[PDB]
């Protein structure tokens, strides 16, 4: 199914997210507060790992699929519970603790090697016993300041670090030829400005020996200059020299690299002939305006020294969502192929505003010289709610959602149509003085009305920043005898958007019909109290369409009493009279006395779960006849009804962990 | 902001590596400053530490000695001074003193300057090992160690028919002695005042020999200079940053 996740808002750490090609499963992982999020199979499955601490950095082992996760003064190592399977799963396997310094940045390398730099650039290995994976602090050293970003290559090239705002990158090569306690040889690698980013070139084919040259280092200086530094074994004689320079134009603000690895795995030999750039890697320089230029290096990886230079390939330009959403910084994990989908590169973007974007650029189109605008299309987006969701409130037009918590972190979201299904999109935050007990959304989400457990009725306007401007407020008397149980937006006899007469159902009757509006303050309406059906409303449930229908003639509340006397009540109100009237539209007497859940649709259907909760009964409100009765081995946790202007009613019966969808089936004349 | 952390990091980076270089340089310098075991020409010669005072080689220049082999055997040996190893020993002693004193220097600038001076001295020693010293090369040797040091060198190296001035071929990172024989001239290309009588080159007896002890010292000095190059670059980077 086209199931889209929102696992959790990502952190702002540079290494907060890393894509990795373990066995071509194209794992992706990222840190969100107290959680780690691992998306395994084409991002169609999710695994979340809970840890009682903010996760600083995460990195993935390409060789063996091990995850290294930094937090506080320690690191955790997780391994695929089974080293190979169609549906991988990660479980805790090891712990790393060296000193009392939070592990600011962390990475992974060949054969279980890690460069866990906190302030000292600890280097380790973990893979021993019959599967203890007991780590060995093979090296340790201090730094001028905490490491903001680190990088580790395979084999002799060893490690590089920078530190925040650092202008010289401490290269530590694997100086000692042998011995577990290897000492690392230093180099400064001066730059004219603080490093913005950096990364090693890729060459996995050299394994298992790993003794190879041309470990070129990519480094972007703060002076709009990308730099490629040559490297070679040469008995450790290479190298701290800049091999190639690329000054970005003032329009350019971001840069990314696609290694020869990806091109070789994607383009075929016949296709590789044009533009015939397979001799080196590719570099894409983009600007916030969208426009971007892609170029190819000349002999950027040739073992003998070569005159490296930037040779342009194409001048592309994609939409706003394809490059950046006006973010301050973007962290771009390594671009890797989307598993066996030839010709597609899983470009990722970290927007540092709570959203990660997955684009799936088509490489053959990217390098197309005689080509038009970029074809990148938003494939997935990852974000999440701040703390937790206590309840979800739906706008009856279905185009806005209000997430409410036990705290004041309420959010107004809108569904967003991606290239792969649909996903929510936070648009505003409704800050509240106390938890919202009930609420109702209007104006396609731009206006919100809520009632707090404190009793305050508050009305916000949300026209845009994410700020929600509280425009009106009022308070109730909170008699502590009767209490509200639902809020029904009683439609006006005519389509009216100026005011929204909201009815608070104070248990048995006592409909507080406030004429809430924004341009003018909230009011109060006397009429009227409905039949409480025994002086105690038993499990009232609202009726709402989920489509933009302006009809005022509609039943609003499907009340029920412990005797099963369900009653759907219409709503009629006069703005001039400042009074509202409750009319019993239907009174089907149900055969069930105690019901776990109740709901009804716009199309006159109704659903009730028995007292036991394991039997669902579907009833017709226009006939009073039980249309369906099913018995489930598990309790029915919730029910919810959709609809459309074409009567396409669907009922979702939400069980413990999965939700069934049921739909009406035509009565067959010649069958059962 | 401030490169003070960079300046102070030499103690935690340079200092641990300081003894590994100081001891190696001292070991290399000890060999050069102490006595140690040490047609075609005949015989062999030995160099005692820094100054060679023993010579037993001969010459076989066809043009030398009017066609006769110039067997300028040393008159039982005589004292001599060699500057090729003396400069190396002086540089090594200065480097050791710098490592001993400025290693705990309050200001990293003095330590950086001492390290740079030591590295430059090591590079100079390597260069001098690559090619013979200025006064040791045959063109500018003036028959040194072959006109008076060797017995009967007046005729053995200044024969009437032709001169047979010997020269030290220290161009193979080792000590060697050879000679070039030139007919009498200047009674430009041939010469101007070679040993007071410019002689036009007519034959040569170049012979190449290795240094059992000097080769290892040269290799150690080369490795130390290679390490010191990176050390000096790293040290100067912090100073340039501030």
From Swiss-Prot, chain A:
Q: Tell me the compartments it is located in.
A: Endomembrane system
**What domain of life is recorded for the organism?**
Eukaryota
WD repeat start and end residues: 98-134, 142-182, 190-239, 384-423, 431-464, 588-629, 631-672
Could you tell me what this protein does?
Component of the RAVE complex, which is required for stable assembly of the vacuolar ATPase complex V-ATPase under many conditions. Required for transport between the early endosome and the late endosome/prevacuolar compartment (PVC), suggesting that assembly of vacuolar ATPase at the early endosome is required for transport from the early endosome to the PVC.
Description of how the protein assembles with itself and partners: Component of the RAVE complex composed of RAV1, RAV2 and CBF3D/SKP1. Within the complex, it interacts directly with RAV2 and CBF3D. Interacts with the V-ATPase V1 subunits VMA1, VMA2 and VMA8.
Any extra remark in the record? Present with 149 molecules/cell in log phase SD medium.
Q: What is this protein called?
A: Regulator of V-ATPase in vacuolar membrane protein 1
Q: Which gene encodes it?
A: RAV1
Report where the shown chain sits in the full-length sequence: first residue, last residue, total length: 1 to 679 of 1357
UniProtKB/Swiss-Prot annotation, chain B:
- Spell out where the chain crosses the membrane: none
Q: Which GO terms describe its cellular component?
A: early endosome membrane; endomembrane system; RAVE complex
Keywords from UniProt, A to Z, are: Cytoplasm, Endosome, Membrane, Protein transport, Transport
Name the principal localization, coarsely classed. Answer: cytoplasm
Q: Where in the cell is it found?
A: Cytoplasm; Early endosome membrane
How it assembles, according to the record, is: Component of the RAVE complex composed of RAV1, RAV2 and CBF3D/SKP1. Within the complex, it interacts directly with RAV1 and CBF3D. Interacts with the V-ATPase V1 subunits VMA1, VMA2 and VMA8.
Q: What gene is it encoded by?
A: RAV2
Q: What does this protein do?
A: Component of the RAVE complex, which is required for stable assembly of the vacuolar ATPase complex V-ATPase under many conditions. May be required for transport between the early endosome and the late endosome/prevacuolar compartment (PVC).
> What highest taxon heads this organism's lineage?
Eukaryota
Q: Which GO terms describe its biological process?
A: protein transport; regulation of protein-containing complex assembly; vacuolar acidification; vacuolar proton-transporting V-type ATPase complex assembly
Q: Does the keyword Transport apply?
A: yes
**Topology in membrane:** Peripheral membrane protein
Q: Which InterPro entries match?
A: RAVE2/Rogdi
Q: Provide the protein name.
A: Regulator of V-ATPase in vacuolar membrane protein 2
Q: Does the keyword Lipid metabolism apply?
A: no
Q: Which Pfam families match?
A: Rogdi_lz
Q: Which miscellaneous remark does the UniProt record hold?
A: Present with 2860 molecules/cell in log phase SD medium.
